[PDB]
A paper describes a structure:
The 2-deoxy-D-ribose-5-phosphate aldolase (DERA) is an enzyme involved in nucleotide catabolism. Furthermore, all DERAs investigated in this study form constitutive dimers.
The X-ray structures of both psychrophilic DERAs were determined with resolutions of 2.1 Å for C. psychrerythraea and 1.8 Å for S. halifaxensis. Comparing the substrate binding pockets of the new structures with DERAEC, no amino acid exchanges or significant conformational differences were found within a radius of 5 Å about the natural substrate (as represented by the covalent intermediate included in PDBID 1JCL12). DERAs from psychrophilic species had a similar thermostability and were around 20 K less stable than DERAEC. The relative B-factor distribution of the backbone atoms reveals a tendency towards increased flexibility in helices 0, 6, and 7 of the psychrophilic DERAs, compared to DERAEC. Hence, our X-ray structures provide independent clues in favor of the hypothesis that adaption to low temperatures in psychrophilic DERAs involves a more flexible environment of the substrate binding pocket. Further tests for the DERACP-A95Cox variant revealed a much longer half-life at 50 °C (>80 min vs. 1 min for the wt) and 86 ± 8% of the wt activity.
Author numbering:
A (entry chain A), B (entry chain B): 2 to 247
The structure:
């Protein structure tokens, strides 16, 4: 089968994630070590903001500057308080984050407020400029309908998202093929320089193949590189390594 | 009662502190609610940086905007990594901190390195410039000798500290009368605009009265206001309230 090539590609696109909120410094350092895997480096790691300085030091020491540090803000609830989301994003940037995964206020959109979503992504993009990329989590599992998923994707991109992301991993339904298709379609129609990040429930190479196949069909075989595509996952890495015989 | 006069004074100078590192948002909100006591507002609360936005919302919600939000960095170990301490301080400010309690690299000082402590305080002070006050924790319990306690105090003040603070609360010996006398004397001799914060072990009004008397005797009855004196404590508030009859 084609499963090993898929596994290799997926691994290089991973945001290797630990978000238990009870990590120790040692566990953060181990995560940095694991990101440098026998089958190549992941695109990035993803951790809570306070761990960024320890991670930055660990990544420098093992000489992996191409492994970026992602973090999360307004996470995971996606509340509609702009001052809080902005302060957290500024802090993340001040910590040294390379990327900030911001949770879009999806409940406010559901209730019919499209403005708060736009304003929040916009100010957080401004705060990131010259320091970090902005990924926006729209929580497709809660948005449910194709209409809202499309809408949220369009608003996020209009407001300045560098990536659009499916899920926080913290609700019942996270990444799904149908949600992925809608978001990739919005990217193709609006801005192919905006990246896509399926996250939550991506267990193995088979799952990974689902989303890579969609990106390939919709935007072309060459589109999904580390600057256009990420897998938000944790235990996926162990699975991929096993598929690759490590 | 003379001691009720003390309980009232000490209460108004408190940094009501919770640093378990497992706080919930509700526990942070509860802490703010406690800062608004039946005997008046404390000077500040002190919490880990990630809780600052929620606390700020909670204090505004209860219409107590003048209760300061302090936080901690390089805490509690006081390592000698400037880049880490700087990043954490920048983040604390970006979160919205009114005050940052930085732990001085006291082990480095004990080892004969004076420059790293000076440099750390200076860049962290510059990081606070125009947004926050900087408290410097010198850890008198570990410095032990009067010479070292005096030295750390002088370094902190010369490098730009707004307060010098006795202890983290995390070592064997925290706030002591003897360490307070040394630190207040340096303040009197060098820069009377620099505040003093005894922390850890101040259980009640009698304990409070000890440090307030030292400040009064050394610098004058008028010197010790919320801009020059703080109590770093937790359980002390319940005791003071019990003294004032609440």
């Amino acid at each position: 089968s084609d499963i090993k090539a898929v596994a290799q590609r997926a691994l290089s696109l991973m945001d290797l994630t630990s978000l238990t909120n009870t990590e120790t410094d040692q566990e953060i350092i181990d995560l940095c070590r694991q990101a440098k895997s026998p089958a190549g480096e992941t695109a990035a790691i993803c951790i809570f903001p306070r761990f960024i300085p320890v991670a930055k030091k660990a990544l420098k020491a093992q000489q992996t500057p191409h492994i970026k540090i992602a973090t999360v803000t307004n996470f995971p609830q996606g509340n509609d308080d702009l001052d809080i989301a902005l302060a957290e994003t500024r802090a993340a940037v001040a910590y040294g984050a390379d990327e900030v995964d911001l949770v879009f206020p999806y409940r406010a959109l559901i209730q019919g407020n499209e403005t708060i979503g736009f304003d929040m992504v916009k100010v957080c993009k401004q705060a990131c400029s010259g320091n970090a990329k902005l990924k926006v989590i729209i929580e497709t599992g809660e948005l449910k309908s194709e209409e809202l998923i499309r809408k949220a994707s369009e608003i996020a991109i209009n407001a300045g998202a560098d990536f659009i992301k499916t899920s926080t991993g913290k609700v019942a339904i996270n990444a799904t093929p149908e949600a992925a298709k809608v978001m990739l379609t919005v990217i193709k129609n609006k801005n192919t320089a905006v990246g896509f990040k399926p996250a939550g429930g991506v267990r193995n190479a088979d799952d990974a193949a689902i989303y890579l196949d969609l990106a390939d069909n919709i935007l072309g075989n060459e589109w999904a590189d580390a600057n256009h595509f990420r897998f938000g996952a944790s235990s996926l890495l162990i699975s991929l390594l096993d598929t690759l015989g490590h």
